[PDB]
From Swiss-Prot, chain B:
Gene (name only): MYH7
Quaternary assembly: Muscle myosin is a hexameric protein that consists of 2 heavy chain subunits (MHC), 2 alkali light chain subunits (MLC) and 2 regulatory light chain subunits (MLC-2). Interacts with ECPAS. Interacts (via C-terminus) with LRRC39.
Functional note: Myosins are actin-based motor molecules with ATPase activity essential for muscle contraction. Forms regular bipolar thick filaments that, together with actin thin filaments, constitute the fundamental contractile unit of skeletal and cardiac muscle.
Domain of life: Eukaryota
Covered range of the whole protein: 1777 to 1855 of 1935
Protein name per Swiss-Prot or TrEMBL: Myosin-7
Domain notes: The rodlike tail sequence is highly repetitive, showing cycles of a 28-residue repeat pattern composed of 4 heptapeptides, characteristic for alpha-helical coiled coils. Limited proteolysis of myosin heavy chain produces 1 light meromyosin (LMM) and 1 heavy meromyosin (HMM). HMM can be further cleaved into 2 globular subfragments (S1) and 1 rod-shaped subfragment (S2).
Pathology noted in the entry: Cardiomyopathy, familial hypertrophic, 1: A hereditary heart disorder characterized by ventricular hypertrophy, which is usually asymmetric and often involves the interventricular septum. The symptoms include dyspnea, syncope, collapse, palpitations, and chest pain. They can be readily provoked by exercise. The disorder has inter- and intrafamilial variability ranging from benign to malignant forms with high risk of cardiac failure and sudden cardiac death.
Other remarks on this protein: The cardiac alpha isoform is a 'fast' ATPase myosin, while the beta isoform is a 'slow' ATPase.
Cellular localization per UniProt: Cytoplasm, Myofibril; Cytoplasm, Myofibril, Sarcomere
Record family assignment: Belongs to the TRAFAC class myosin-kinesin ATPase superfamily. Myosin family.
């Protein structure tokens, strides 16, 4: 009810000689009207509550959009048609070095057991050679053990001794 | 803004056919004040509510803006080759990766095996001074042998023993 439309009811109960019927029906008006605006008000608090929620969800949307926009603006910064196919000038400036630095490595351990086929061959040689050396040293110092004692002074034994040292 | 039960038990204090007039005026005043309050607070809620209505139209238009812009960017990127471009960056980084891998493993068994074949350059050494010793001792032996073949007299017991050794 309007502000005026209320007052016009309130200043008609002011008369204490008001017929009980008119009184009861005026009070009825007050009741249904007050009920009506309680209902309306509550509806407005529920509706206002709705907008407040939608506002809470539309903000989160907007924000997300901004983010999704930002990245999408910088993704489009990555070259038109020239920087595109420049990358393929990279992908096989790499595929080159990719095989070159695995062809040369694979080779380098071809060098690994090219090198072992002789470092284990040069152990087979370093031992039998030392065996022969040891043999001739054995003979040498048998002979040399004999060339002692008789130092006092056979000419022939003196030239052999001269050979021994 | 009193609850409707209170409004009601007020409304019961007005149907009394001959209530004290002062109480009647008091009641009606109560009603008018309460209604004034209800109206004002409702006008406040109407003000606030109308506000949200406005900032809902502003935000709805903003989204409609952003969305469009987004599409635009997603189209400009896509028309400039986005799927093929990134697909190259998928390969560039992969190749960089395994190339790095093989640079690493190469760097290692190029490190620890010219680190390995100083041994040859040592072993070789070992097989040529030893050799020398051999070819040295032998020499001397054969030298003595020649001296024993340069003897006119029959082998004196000592020289006979030495000659007897000189078989190998």
């Amino acid at each position: 009810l309007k502000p005026e439309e209320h007052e016009d009811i309130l200043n008609k109960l002011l008369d204490p000689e008001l017929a009980q019927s008119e009184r009861t029906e005026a009070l009825q008006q007050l009741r249904v009207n007050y009920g009506s605006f309680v209902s309306e008000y509550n509806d407005l608090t529920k509706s206002h509550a709705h907008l407040e929620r939608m506002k809470k969800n539309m903000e989160q949307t907007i924000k997300d959009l901004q983010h999704r926009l930002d990245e999408a603006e910088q993704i489009a910064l990555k070259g038109g048609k020239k920087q595109l196919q420049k990358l393929e000038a990279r992908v096989r400036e790499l595929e080159n070095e990719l095989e070159a630095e695995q062809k040369r490595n694979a080779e380098s351990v071809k060098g690994m057991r090219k090198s072992e086929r002789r470092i284990k061959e040069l152990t087979y040689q370093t031992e039998d050679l030392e065996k022969e050396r040891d043999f001739y040293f054995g003979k040498l110092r048998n002979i040399e053990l004999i060339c002692q004692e008789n130092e006092g002074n056979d000419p022939v034994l003196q030239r052999i001794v001269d050979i021994l040292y």
